[PDB]
Amino acid sequence: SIWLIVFGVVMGVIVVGIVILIFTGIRDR
Amino acid sequence: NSLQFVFACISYAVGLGNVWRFPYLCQMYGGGSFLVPYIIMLIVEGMPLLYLELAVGQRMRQGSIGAWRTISPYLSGVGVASVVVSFFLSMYYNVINAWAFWYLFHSFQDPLPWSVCPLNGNHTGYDEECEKASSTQYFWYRKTLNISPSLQENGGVQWEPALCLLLAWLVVYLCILRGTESTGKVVYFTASLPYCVLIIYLIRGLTLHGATNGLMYMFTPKIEQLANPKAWINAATQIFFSLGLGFGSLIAFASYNEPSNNCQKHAIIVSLINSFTSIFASIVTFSIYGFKATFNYENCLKKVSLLLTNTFDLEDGFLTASNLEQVKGYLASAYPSKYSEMFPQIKNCSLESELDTAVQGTGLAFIVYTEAIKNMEVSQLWSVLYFFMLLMLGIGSMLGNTAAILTPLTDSKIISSHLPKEAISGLVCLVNCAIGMVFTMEAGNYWFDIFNDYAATLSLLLIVLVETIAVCYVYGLRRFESDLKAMTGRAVSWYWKVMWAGVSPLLIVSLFVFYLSDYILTGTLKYQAWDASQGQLVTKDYPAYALAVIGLLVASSTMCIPLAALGTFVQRR
Ligand SMILES: *[C@@H]1O[C@H](CO)[C@@H](O)[C@H](O)[C@H]1NC(C)=O
Ligand SMILES: *[C@@H]1O[C@H](CO)[C@@H](O)[C@H](O)[C@H]1NC(C)=O
Ligand SMILES: O=C(O)[C@@H]1CCCCN1
Ligand SMILES: [Cl-]
């Protein structure tokens, strides 16, 4: 199913973005 | 500084209430019969109260709770309630975004899912429900929601909508964490892309066969259904929900503006731009809807002609739509014995009935625009563009709403001294996403219907009524006018004073009285439910447990005001 592949890619990139932003914010403070 | 504030207010106001909610609200309540009150309710309710909110944000120069607490302590509750409503909004609004995500992900396929019905099972025809309804309607009601036939019947949590809602909430949380003041180029971009996409769909939407039927249905003010109090109620509540009145974040936005600014120009411009965007989006939607209605009418006429021709052994092209009644009379006069058998079977179809009952419900925008996409050349590109514009609008509106939710929480030193703001926002998003899973069930569309019509509908009227009475009578309109004149050099116009003091509260009270009287007289609250066997929408009475939630959603937010007054009186005594 192509919709599942696209959703997996999008969710992966969004989760990596959230993780990096939280980690950078915590490390800065 | 004017451009920044004006575009911030526009970006807050222009969202899914303009592109998604307005079209189906207009369709449900008669088209023109809903548009005439809307405009009537915009001059009286929209502009004066939006200006009052923007002025209260400036003369106080505090937050919503701070302002309504500084005017008088006995009133501080209206600052708390204005948060709670936002909560309920953020509880269900995201579901819409989720749906768009779904419709985006099913847009990279050559055989678009809403374009071709599945095979029946013989591999010789189409599905019964997919044929009785449209392919777009079948995709929306079965492939997307899998809607249960009644509210009493619900299954488990559908995992695909749950994942889409989880993804939408993750995107909202990422947008919360990432940016707060970098909207510089975004305001140059996110404000023109919806208009460009609507322009493209208008260029397609006004050249379809029978596009004028949709516009005529839209702009005809039928007097017979213009007397419905529910139409006026829905118009006023949609105005309040689209301008953001009662949510309390407009006061916060205006709190950061200079006191030597013209809030009479800005309020007028924002309200007019919101109205124009709603009208334009609804015009495009109703042009496509009229094309759908014309196609359904032509299909019914063709089916009836084929039925008569296959039986009376008429010529192939002899029986057309321009000579249908005359040939029917001729055939009936020829011999009645044969005509008697199928007379029940011959169906009457007209443009009007199709226009009322072609497509209706909260999925009107999705169904209509998927239909329009399936009639394009490169359907994939236009589907991506439209469902990306919708995603931007929803994400922006939710950023505004969640900022309104979170600012009181961050400003509270009790919570801010224990957990980081990055964790407070995460907890808020997690609670909202976990509670919003009730909209992903099989019967979740009915709960979405309940929340879209009662969570932030009448409470927005009562909050604004209390706010305007507070500003005019408790604080003193003369004192407020003097303060505003000293702040900006110009005294408030007499028209704005008239609309603040008497006209808007009286109209709100009259609307509330009419709605209550209509509900009492009817005594049976009903909702639309999908019927796959009949392939349309039927009206069913709300069950006993559905009225409790409906009552509580309004009651908590509205009654949060009197309870605070009682608590303050107890504290004093
Ligand atoms: C096609 O399927 C229907 C059931 O929906 C059945 O009644 C019909 O006999 C089938 N046609 C043939 C040729 O078997
Ligand atoms: C169609 O119209 C005729 C005459 O007005 C009426 O008798 C009939 O019940 C209607 N409906 C159908 C399905 O024939
Ligand atoms: O137009 C919208 O979609 C938003 C909803 C929230 C309040 C502001 N307007
Ligand atoms: Cl609107």
Please describe what this structure looks like.
Chain A is mainly alpha-helical and 29 residues long. In chain A, 93% of the residues lie in helices and 0% in strands. Chain A has one helix spanning 2-28. Chain A starts with a helix and ends with a helix. Chain B is mainly α. The chains are: A mainly alpha (29), B mainly alpha (573). At the A-B interface, helix 1 of A face helix 5 and helix 8 of B. The complex binds 2-acetamido-2-deoxy-beta-D-glucopyranose (2 copies), (2S)-piperidine-2-carboxylic acid and chloride ion (CL). Residues 120, 122 of chain B line the site of one 2-acetamido-2-deoxy-beta-D-glucopyranose. (2S)-piperidine-2-carboxylic acid binds at residues 12-13, 15-18, 241-242, 244, 247, 397, 401 of chain B. The PDB classes it as membrane protein.
Task: Note the total helix count of chain A.
Answer: 1
Beta content of chain A: under 5%
The count of DSSP E runs of length 2 or more, i.e. the number of strands of chain A, is: 0
In terms of DSSP E residues, the strand content of chain B is under 5%
Helix content of chain B: over 70%
What percent of the residues of chain A sit in helical stretches (DSSP H or I)?
A: over 70%
Rg of chain B over CA atoms, rounded to whole Å, is 26 Å
Number of domain modules of chain B: 1
Q: Which chains make the largest contact? A: A-B, 16 and 19 residues
Q: Widest sheet of chain B: strand order?
A: 1-2
Number of strands of chain B: 2
| Overall shape of chain A | rod-shaped
Q: Strand count, sense and closure of the main sheet of chain A?
A: none
- What gyration radius of chain A follows from the Cα positions, in whole Å? 13 Å
State the shape of chain B.
elongated
Oligomer: heterodimer
